[PDB]
């Protein structure tokens, strides 16, 4: 019944059949992206129409297509041929990654570079990375990956310990040609291993950790219906999954007495960029768009009970398409559980004699993905008190290089001769807002300091100000931690009992945004990452801050193009795009495998309720 249910294997197979029937999926075609579309605005009024969007690649080099299918009706809604040099290449195919090492292994230039370094080609792994857009005119309209080399000494060796600096190659993964091999000079390949399961390196394992047992003897407090509809402690939502974005939350709402009150229509991480800050030509092109170029959902891990997710866990196993349109399940790819969260509210009152304490808890929805050396966890939290929070967890093995003799301003040393280039991990959260419905606006709120003088003779007063963002031209905003800057999303047509528009306040971490020079390729391609907050008017085709096709795509799409429309956002259907990230100067403690570091944001109700929403929580 629910139009927000997860895609099923049968739906994916049926999309395959519809595409085949339409002549759009012959043997040379590959599915580079496939996902269910959300129901149209106002659609609830009518019957089910489950539509899927597909990006179809052609291994013969013919132009690819973007296609929308109605699986319900068995029809192709639209099919358009793409000019990729203009609008962007399709996301990288899992099958294209392996091409790189294979092709390089028989290239005379590559072999000569390896021989100069006394390296056995059979032991050289190649990290096949996205190419971006630089000065190589021959790449325009071609699907390129760039390869960086790492030595793997034996089958279970961590190759990341042994970067081969001074060497990079470019490969056309459709024509299967090595277009360039660049060798700027030999660097020693760091010899120390980074094998974090080798007893020689770990030493004797700790015997001091006693078990922590977390159980729910009566089961969890949330219910799951229709496969992915969650109800928990007044909250209601649907947990979606998309191969590009990963976990997507739909219809986040809170049951306040008799009213189901919407808060956020759709929440997702709509892009993530990982830009490298080492000016060496070996890596100066290196920027991952894990969401837009790689598709983070497709690399979601299967999460193990007791290790990845502890306690009473309810799993979802989302289905995605493989390269041929066949369904494949990611078993136990999404964890759902509730966690104790310490004290909720507490007061010991002298005058009344009443001592009161209540405990907090949060609902958790999470998944974990692996992109080469890096592993990222995506966690959404709902709290009893109405707070909504997202947290990203970064771990894995840091990307390495040689450490230059004489040091570096752009690389840190992890081990003898082993460097780790500086980089960032920057996320964009797309929050399609629906505070008490779709009529919303955003205000920027700053603390206001006041001068000592008349009306403030003791110089103690302080205040705040709010500025409504009325049009998209006014809605590209930056952090100001010093002035406690936040952004409030409110509904000017829905008032609380004190006659104030109901709202939610976004609290950012105020981490640095994109550091690259504004004239760089990456600043143009990751324009969203240069500012902390953007507000747009909702539109069906405005899904990602980087546009539909990010791979080898220049500036020209995404948020800067959307904002130019200068639409009314003052009491309208709006979308907040929040940039937030980590700036990583790797430390020795990050090696040989990195302890988790985190970044995120939260929203708290701001006069959304008529009083605390947790007065009906019982004593523990």
Q: Is 374 one of the catalytic residues?
A: yes
Residue 425 assigned to a binding site = yes
Which residues within the stretch 538-557 sit at the binding site for Na ion (CB under 5 A)? 538
Catalytic residue among 33, 170, 276, 374: 374
Which residues within the stretch 564-583 sit at the binding site for Na ion (CB under 5 A)? 573
* Interacting residue with Na ion among 144, 433, 506, 599 (CB under 5 A): 433
Q: What gap in Å lies between CA 160 and CA 129, rounded to an integer?
A: 14
Nearest CA to 129 out of 273, 282, 243, 286 is that of 286
Nearest CA to 526 out of 562, 554, 498 is that of 554
State yes or no: residue 233 binds Na ion (CB under 5 A). no
CB of 46 to K ion, least distance (A): 16
Task: Tell me the CA end-to-end span of the chain in Å, nearest whole number.
Answer: 37
For residue 9, give the H/E element and its range: helix 9-21
Q: What gap in Å lies between CA 589 and CA 591, rounded to an integer?
A: 5
Nearest residue to Cu ion by CB is 584
Residue 294 assigned to a binding site = yes
* Neighbouring residues of 131: CB distance < 8 A, sequence distance ≥ 6: 139, 144, 145, 146, 170, 285, 551, 552
State yes or no: residue 214 binds a second copy (CB under 8 A). yes
Which residues within the stretch 224-263 sit at the binding site for a second copy (CB under 8 A)? 233, 257
CB of 588 to a second copy, least distance (A): 5
State yes or no: residue 283 binds Cu ion (CB under 5 A). no
State yes or no: residue 607 binds a second copy (CB under 8 A). yes
* Interacting residue with Na ion among 101, 278, 432, 548 (CB under 5 A): 432
Instruction: Residue 217: count other Cβ atoms within 10 Å of its Cβ.
Output: 5
Nearest residue to K ion by CB is 74
Q: Is 172 one of the catalytic residues?
A: no
Q: What gap in Å lies between CA 444 and CA 492, rounded to an integer?
A: 15
State yes or no: residue 57 binds Cu ion (CB under 5 A). no
Catalytic residue among 38, 157, 242, 290: 290
Q: What, of Na ion, Cu ion, a second copy, none, does residue 573 touch, CB below 5 to 8 Å by kind?
A: Na ion
State yes or no: residue 415 binds a second copy (CB under 8 A). yes
CB of 492 to a second copy, least distance (A): 17
CB of 67 to K ion, least distance (A): 16
- Residue 61 contacts residue 84 (beta carbons within 8 Å): no
Q: What gap in Å lies between CA 270 and CA 546, rounded to an integer?
A: 9
Q: What, of a second copy, Cu ion, K ion, none, does residue 208 touch, CB below 5 to 8 Å by kind?
A: a second copy
If you search the block for the tokens 């939610």, which residue do you land on?
504
Bridge-based pairing of strands 223-225 and 177-183 is: unpaired
Q: What, of Cu ion, Na ion, a second copy, none, does residue 44 touch, CB below 5 to 8 Å by kind?
A: none
Collapsed DSSP state (helix, strand, coil) of residue 618: coil
Residue 299 assigned to a binding site = yes
- Show the binding pattern over residues 37-76: x = contacts K ion (CB under 5 A), - = does not: -------------------------------------x--
- Residue 77 contacts residue 54 (beta carbons within 8 Å): no
Residue 431 assigned to a binding site = no
Nearest CA to 613 out of 407, 440, 383 is that of 383
State yes or no: residue 304 binds a second copy (CB under 8 A). yes
Which residues within the stretch 567-596 sit at the binding site for Cu ion (CB under 5 A)? 584
CB of 387 to a second copy, least distance (A): 8
Residue 381 assigned to a binding site = no
**Concatenated DSSP letters for 483-544?**
GT-EEEEEEEEEE-TTS-EEEEEEEE-------S-TTSHHHHHTGGGGSSEEEEE--TT---
Convert 479-500 into a string of H (helix), E (strand) and C (coil). Answer: CCHHHCCEEEEEEEEEECCCCC
- Residue 55 contacts residue 33 (beta carbons within 8 Å): yes
Q: What, of K ion, Cu ion, a second copy, none, does residue 74 touch, CB below 5 to 8 Å by kind?
A: K ion
CB of 218 to Cu ion, least distance (A): 36
How many chain residues interact with a second copy (CB under 8 A)?
151
Enumerate the known binding-site residues.
288-299, 371-376, 423, 425, 584
Per CB under 5 A, residues contacting Cu ion are 584
Q: Which of the residues are catalytic?
A: 290, 374
Enumerate the known binding-site residues for Cu cation.
423, 425, 584
């Amino acid at each position: 019944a629910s139009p927000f249910r997860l895609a099923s294997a049968g739906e994916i197979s049926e999309v395959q059949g519809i595409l085949r029937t339409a002549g759009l999926l012959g043997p040379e075609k590959r599915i580079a992206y496939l996902g269910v579309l959300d129901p149209a605005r106002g659609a609830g009024s009518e019957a089910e129409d489950r539509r899927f969007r597909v990006f179809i690649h052609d291994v013969s080099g013919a132009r690819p297509q973007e296609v929308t299918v109605s699986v319900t009706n068995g029809t192709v809604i639209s099919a358009v041929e793409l000019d990729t040099a203009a609008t962007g290449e399709l996301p990288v195919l899992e099958e294209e990654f392996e091409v790189v090492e294979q092709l390089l292994a028989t290239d005379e230039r590559w072999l000569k570079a390896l021989a100069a370094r006394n390296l056995d080609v059979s032991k050289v792994r190649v990290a096949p990375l996205s190419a971006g857009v630089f000065e190589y005119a021959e790449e325009r309209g071609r699907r390129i990956l760039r390869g960086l080399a790492f030595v793997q000494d034996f089958p279970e060796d961590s190759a990341w310990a042994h970067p081969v600096d001074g060497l990079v190659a470019y490969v056309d993964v459709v024509s299967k040609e090595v277009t360039r091999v660049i060798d700027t000079g030999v660097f020693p390949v760091p010899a120390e291993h980074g094998n974090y399961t080798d007893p020689e390196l770990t030493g004797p394992l700790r015997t001091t950790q006693k078990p922590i047992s977390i159980t729910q003897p009566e089961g969890p407090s949330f219910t799951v219906t229709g496969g992915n509809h969650i109800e928990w402690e007044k909250w209601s939502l649907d947990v979606g999954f998309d191969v590009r974005e990963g976990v997507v939350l739909h219809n986040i709402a809170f049951r306040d007495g008799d009213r189901l009150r919407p808060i956020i229509n759709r929440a997702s991480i709509a892009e993530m960029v990982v830009p490298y800050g080492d000016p060496s030509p070996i890596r100066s092109w290196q920027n991952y768009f894990d969401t837009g170029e790689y598709l983070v959902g497709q690399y979601a891990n299967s999460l193990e009970l007791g290790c990845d997710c502890l306690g009473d866990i309810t799993y979802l196993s989302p289905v995605i398409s493989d390269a041929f349109g066949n369904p494949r399940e990611i078993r136990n790819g999404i964890c759902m559980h509730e966690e104790d969260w310490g004290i909720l509210a507490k007061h010991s009152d002298l005058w009344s004699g009443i001592n009161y304490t209540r405990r907090n808890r949060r609902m958790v929805i999470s998944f974990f993905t692996t992109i080469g050396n890096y592993d990222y966890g995506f966690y959404w939290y709902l709290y009893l008190d109405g707070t909504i929070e997202f947290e990203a967890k970064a771990t894995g093995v840091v990307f390495t290089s040689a450490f230059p003799e004489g040091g570096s301003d752009n690389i840190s040393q992890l081990a003898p001769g082993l460097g780790a280039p500086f980089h960032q991990h920057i996320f964009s959260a797309r929050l399609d807002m629906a505070i008490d419905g779709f009529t919303n606006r955003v205000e920027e709120e700053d603390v206001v300091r006041q001068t000592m003088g008349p009306g403030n003779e003791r110089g103690n007063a302080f205040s705040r100000k709010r500025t409504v963002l009325t049009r998209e031209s006014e809605a590209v905003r930056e952090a100001d931690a010093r002035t406690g800057r936040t952004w409030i999303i409110s509904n000017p047509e829905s008032k609380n009992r004190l006659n104030e528009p109901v709202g939610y306040k976004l609290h950012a971490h105020n981490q640095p945004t994109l550091l690259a020079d504004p004239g760089s390729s990456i600043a143009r391609r990751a324009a969203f990452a240069t500012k902390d907050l953007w507000v747009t008017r909702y539109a069906d085709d405005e899904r990602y801050p980087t546009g539909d096709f990010v791979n080898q795509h220049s500036g020209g799409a995404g948020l800067p193009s959307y904002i130019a429309q200068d639409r009314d956002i003052d009491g309208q259907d709006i979308v907040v795009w929040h940039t937030f990230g980590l700036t990583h100067f790797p430390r020795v403690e990050d090696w040989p495998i990195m302890p988790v570091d985190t970044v995120g944001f939260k929203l708290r109700p701001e006069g959304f309720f008529d009083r605390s929403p947790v007065l009906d929580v019982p004593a523990n």
